[PDB]
Subunit: 87 residues, 2 copies
């Protein structure tokens, strides 16, 4: 399980000039999180916040492969890891 | 959990000219697997086989973030998903 802890100062997203894929500049809500990812310590990594979605509240987390996909290279590849609280 | 089923015809790796990262051609053992990844159906994806490691035997599987890492872009990123049997 790709655990992670959204610090208390990382419970709110912010609107920053985002870019889908070099097509157009989108102002989406971005957030942060701390994924140990097996690194023993928490790693403050960024995260996307759906429009209207509540920033990853303060709590434990576990990435979600719902964002992972199979590329034509025959190898899984995250397209936008969907973070979720750890149960 | 990134589930997956290593078909019965995908329980053995093969030695194919591999390339670490554009540095040198390595002949490692590669294998295959079927990760539904939430796609309802199984997706035959490729996989690497450590030298001396037994190809992903025939059984259920779940990728492993032990291969995932945090890039300097502030976003998790698989470096070489370590597949494992699903328990």
């Amino acid at each position: 399980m790709i655990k992670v802890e959204i610090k208390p100062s990382q419970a709110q997203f912010t609107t920053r000039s985002g870019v889908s894929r070099q097509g157009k500049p989108y102002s989406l809500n971005e957030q942060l999180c701390y994924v140990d990812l097996g690194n023993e310590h928490p790693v403050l990594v960024k995260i996307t916040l759906d429009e209207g979605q509540p920033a990853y509240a303060p709590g434990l987390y576990t990435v979600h492969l719902s964002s992972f996909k199979v590329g034509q290279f025959g190898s899984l590849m995250i397209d936008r890891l969907r973070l979720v609280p750890a149960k």
